[PDB]
């Protein structure tokens, strides 16, 4: 163990090689596995980079190479953030989820280390105060990374939806994108998180955030449409929105209906009858998530068909004066939730750290890192 520990020390201390292997080879030559079923990934295949970084970090601390560890981890933090900010296209969903899972594994370890240092009795009491202050300042930074890469990734997903969602929900006519394309997008998110063993609460967060986004942006599209909002349309809007409601209930979400109420109640407004005062009274009850201002505009921009007579003046006049008297007892658009976002990982308990076996994919080429991982393994008999 003398010569093993010496070779190991020499690898760990010389961080300008080791950083360049990790930065390029592992954090940029990162091959994210496929995000589909019939190819069960284990946890180690999803969190392989994090677990390498832990083996290396555990050893740097064992040997007391603490200034090497902060140069090492400062390069990691920068590189994981750069990778996620540069994501685009087909890989946005799977790459995003891959890194969220790996940062979570890292963060969970640092938390486990910090709690162990404070509780276990291990060396002087000034080197200890600085070791605690090093590991807590580290925890704070990996907390900040989790938060950043989630908000970057989630803002990127909202921008992919915005291109598809307006045309698919508001324009598309399933009796230029379709509702099939929106469902395929949500299927992609569902299967990634399933295949990558993401905690079920993070899925709920992501889909809730995006359904409220679709709700807001499509409602704000609808309410400006001029010769458009007919009875025909409301039926078609109801059918489109129901596809998402029904998807949510077959993929484990019970909040899906709460998230789509501005769309649902707009569809109801266009299908219910509006030619007496009592009809406006129970309409106001049906459309509980709509303000009087929003009702006024949707009603006055309602496209009657041929045959169908227009909304009487009595009615248009009555709605006009419900708005005037609420202002009294003192924007029609819904402001969409673009950010910032609570990190759903922060709300849930960090992953427990039993000693995990030292694995490195055979397709990688990191000779210094491989040898570090090998020499740790050797001392496990």
How would you summarize what this structure contains?
The protein has 381 residues and is mostly helical. The protein has helices spanning 2-13, 15-26, 43-46, 48-62, 66-85, 92-119, 127-171, 179-195, 200-222, 231-249, 261-271, 277-286, 292-300, 313-328, 367-378. The chain has 15 helices and no strands.
How would you describe this structure to a colleague?
Belongs to the TRAFAC class myosin-kinesin ATPase superfamily. Myosin family. Residues 1-381 are annotated as: Non alpha-helical, tail domain. It is found in: Bud neck; Bud tip. Residues 74-325 form the Dilute domain. The chain has helices at residues 2-13, 15-26, 43-46, 48-62, 66-85, 92-119, 127-171, 179-195, 200-222, 231-249, 261-271, 277-286, 292-300, 313-328, 367-378. It starts with a helix and ends with a helix. It is 66% helix and 0% strand. With 381 residues, it is mostly helical.
């Amino acid at each position: 163990a003398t010569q093993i520990n010496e070779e190991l020390y020499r690898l760990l201390e010389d961080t300008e090689i080791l950083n360049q292997e990790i930065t390029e080879g592992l954090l940029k030559g990162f091959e994210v596995p496929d995000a589909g079923v019939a190819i069960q990934l284990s946890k180690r295949d999803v969190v392989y980079p994090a677990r390498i970084l832990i083996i290396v970090l555990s050893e740097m601390w064992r040997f007391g190479l603490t200034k090497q560890s902060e140069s090492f981890l400062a390069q990691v933090l920068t590189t994981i953030q750069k990778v996620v900010t540069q994501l685009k296209g087909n890989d946005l969903i799977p790459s995003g989820v891959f890194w969220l899972a790996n940062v979570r594994e890292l963060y969970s370890f640092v938390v486990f280390a910090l709690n162990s240092i404070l509780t276990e009795e291990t060396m002087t009491d000034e080197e200890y105060k600085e070791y605690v202050s090093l590991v807590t300042e580290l925890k704070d930074d990996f907390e900040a990374l989790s938060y950043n890469i989630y908000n970057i990734w989630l803002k990127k997903l909202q921008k992919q939806l915005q291109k598809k969602a307006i045309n698919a929900v508001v324009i598309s006519e399933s009796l230029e994108y379709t509702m099939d394309d929106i469902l395929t997008f949500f299927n992609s998110i569902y299967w990634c998180m399933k295949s990558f063993h993401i905690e079920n609460e993070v899925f709920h967060a992501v889909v809730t955030t995006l359904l409220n986004y679709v709700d807001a942006i499509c409602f704000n599209e609808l309410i400006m449409k001029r010769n458009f909002l007919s009875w025909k349309r409301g039926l078609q809007l109801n059918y489109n929105v129901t596809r998402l409601e029904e998807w949510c209930k077959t993929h484990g979400l019970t909040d899906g209906t709460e998230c789509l109420q501005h769309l649902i109640q707009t569809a109801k407004l266009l299908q219910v009858r509006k030619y007496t005062i009592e009809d406006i009274d129970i309409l106001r009850g049906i459309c509980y998530s709509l303000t009087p201002a929003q009702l006024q505009k949707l009603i006055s921009q309602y496209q009657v068909a041929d045959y169908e007579s227009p909304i009487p003046q009595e009615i248009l006049r009555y709605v006009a004066d419900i708005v005037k008297k609420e202002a009294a007892l003192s924007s029609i658009f819904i402001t969409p939730e673009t950010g910032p976002f609570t990190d759903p990982f922060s709300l849930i308990k960090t992953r427990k750290f039993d000693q995990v076996e030292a694995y490195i994919p055979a397709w990688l080429s990191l000779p210094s890192t491989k040898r570090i991982v090998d020499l740790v393994a050797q001392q496990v008999v």
